[PDB]
Each structure stands twice: as structure tokens, then as C-alpha cells.
Amino acid sequence: TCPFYKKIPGTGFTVDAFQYGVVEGCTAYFLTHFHSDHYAGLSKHFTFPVYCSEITGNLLKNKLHVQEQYIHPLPLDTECIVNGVKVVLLDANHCPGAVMILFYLPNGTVILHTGDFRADPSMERSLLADQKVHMLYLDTTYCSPEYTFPSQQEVIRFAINTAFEAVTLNPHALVVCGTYSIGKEKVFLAIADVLGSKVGMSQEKYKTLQCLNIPEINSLITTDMCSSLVHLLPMMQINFKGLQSHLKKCGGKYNQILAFRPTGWTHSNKFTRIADVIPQTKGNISIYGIPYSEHSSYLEMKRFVQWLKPQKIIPTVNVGTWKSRSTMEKYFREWKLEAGY
Ligand code: NI
Numbered sequence: 001t002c003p004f005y006k007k008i009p010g011t012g013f014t015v016d017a018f019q020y021g022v023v024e025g026c027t028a029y030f031l032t033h034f035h036s037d038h039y040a041g042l043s044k045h046f047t048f049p050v051y052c053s054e055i056t057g058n059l060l061k062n063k064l065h066v067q068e069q070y071i072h073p074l075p076l077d078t079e080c081i082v083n084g085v086k087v088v089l090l091d092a093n094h095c096p097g098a099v100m101i102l103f104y105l106p107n108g109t110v111i112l113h114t115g116d117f118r119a120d121p122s123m124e125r126s127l128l129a130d131q132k133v134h135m136l137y138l139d140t141t142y143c144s145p146e147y148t149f150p151s152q153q154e155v156i157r158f159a160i161n162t163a164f165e166a167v168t169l170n171p172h173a174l175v176v177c178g179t180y181s182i183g184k185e186k187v188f189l190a191i192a193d194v195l196g197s198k199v200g201m202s203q204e205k206y207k208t209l210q211c212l213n214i215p216e217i218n219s220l221i222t223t224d225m226c227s228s229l230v231h232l233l234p235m236m237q238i239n240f241k242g243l244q245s246h247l248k249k250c251g252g253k254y255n256q257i258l259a260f261r262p263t264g265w266t267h268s269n270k271f272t273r274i275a276d277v278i279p280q281t282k283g284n285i286s287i288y289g290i291p292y293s294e295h296s297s298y299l300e301m302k303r304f305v306q307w308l309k310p311q312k313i314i315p316t317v318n319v320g321t322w323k324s325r326s327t328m329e330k331y332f333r334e335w336k337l338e339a340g341y
Helices: 054-062 121-125 152-169 185-195 203-210 240-249 298-308 322-339
Strands: 013-015 028-030 050-052 071-073 080-082 085-091 099-104 110-113 135-138 173-179 230-234 256-263 280-282 285-291 312-315
Touching: 050 054, 054 071, 121 298, 135 298, 152 173, 152 185, 152 256, 152 285, 173 185, 173 240, 185 230, 185 256, 230 240, 240 256, 240 285, 298 322, 312 322
Parallel strands: 013 028, 028 050, 050 071, 110 135, 135 312, 173 230, 173 256, 256 285
Antiparallel strands: 080 085, 085 099, 099 110, 280 285
16 A cells, blocks of 8 residues: 555655555556666556656666556656646756656645755756745655765766776776666766776666667667676676676686775765775775765755755655654754754
């Protein structure tokens, strides 16, 4: 049974609610982004209308084989009418194709559902600037002040400088980057660009990237592993054992691996600056954990909410424990008292 925080009151709509069977009263199922915890339940046998971005709709058709007649892609930043209700999709600054959804209820209530997002001051000049929001369904993934991490630009500067140094010192070093979902493509694309290489990967990953409308992508990626010195591997293979095994397969072309694991936050963030990050090393293999987040830091979240000034907040992440819920509610009240709404 579908939880209340996935239902939009006063509509026939649900958000990211595909694992509950037929939801009573639902006339349109919205999907914010193509990550498995959110699409869980969709397949080629789904026969209700799904509303989403163009990029999410490419992934649904080619990866999950959802039939075309049930995919309803909407343009961003554009007022659309769905089953009698005005909606707008906004870029969520999450993974490719990820959106926030603005619903303009027939009774005058305005609701923002962030989906998964990384709050940014650029959102303060979207279509959100133009009207009041009563209810905010908020991605609270890192809603506590211990969650700090650098900008995505600082992290990519670290990665490019580390990779270029290593490979210039040793032209026989291979770079490997871990992946297990869409998102974070700038890590491997920025490293391959500085090295003058295409990124090499499996046919299944190539297929996924071909759905993302990234400009000039045919120039940047390939399935010919032998032609590339930046390889993508599943995140589970980014360990000394899996990397040793991969280096064997490359036929003595390479004699060293430098590997990256883009994580979100890890507790080494509460002590160490990005500049001071060091790898774990075993022989000719080094592994860097880099804090490349596609979710809001605590401070980014707080700034967004204090600007938007919603009347009510409904968290969508960390809702399963009383301790988490009580923590989050305490911060929402602080933010409101400090800002004066
Ligand atoms: Ni996500």
C-alpha cells in the first residue's frame, strides 16, 4: 500500500509510486527520475499513463521496454494541463532527466515535489520565483548539519588534476571509474577529455548513455575498450581484487590502475578537505573515494527552504525512524524561526 507522502491530495496523482500495484484513485503516475528506488515496479506490462521528462521517457522505452502509447514526456519550464490540472516540470540538478514537479491544485493550493534534487541558487530564478508554494515534498537525504561536501566543480577539478598527473608520469597507467546507475557522468567525461581519450564501457552502459541527450556524445564514448584509456566498470568491481582481474584482461597494455569511486558523503568529510584526499593503495593499484554529490548539502537545503518559505514541509527521505523524523522537524522549526515565516 502506497504511503501518504507519495500522494498529491486533490488530484488523481501519485509520484514515484510504481511498486504498490494499482493505486486506488490514481489516473496518472508521475516519475521524477530513472533511479531504481523510484521506478521500482515499472516494466513492459505497465498500462497506465506515466508522466516524466523526455530523457526519463527514452530510458523507460529502451531500458525497461515500457510501450510508447503509455509514455507521456513533457517539456521543461512549460505550463502543461494533465487530467485537468496545471503542472510544470523543473530541472532538479540531480541525474540526467531528473525533475521537480509544480502542481497548481484546482482549489488554489500550490505544491512543489522536489523528487531527488541538489538545491542551487539558480532555482531562485526559475518559474518558482513567480508564486507562493503552500506545501513542499522535500528530498531530505542529507538533512543534518554534519553533511558537508564540496561543490561539484571543486571535485571535478581534483579528479582531472589527479588523473592528468598520473598518466603523464606513467603513459602505461589505465584510469577506471565506477558506476551503478545514471548520474555523475561528468566524473568520467571530464577525465577522458583531459586525457584525449573516449570513455570505454559495456554495451549495456553504452545503451543507457545513448538515451541521455548529451551533446556530441558519439564523440565521447565507445564500446571498443582497446581504443580507450578511461574504462567504466560496475561499482562492485572497484576494489583491489576486481581491479587486478580487469588489468589481466588488458593484455599487458597497462601496468598501473588509478580508480575513482564517486560516493555521496562519507565520514572522512567531517575531517578532510578535498585538496588533502589520498587514495587506498596496494601495489600498482590506487583507489580514490571522491565526494561527488547529486543531493543537497545541509546548507544548500536550508538556503532553498528559507527562500521558498513553504507553509508545510513533508519529507520524502529518512521517514522510517522516529529519531530521523524528530531531527528533521526540529531543523524545519529552526529555519522558520530564524527567517521569520
Ligand atoms: Ni535519485
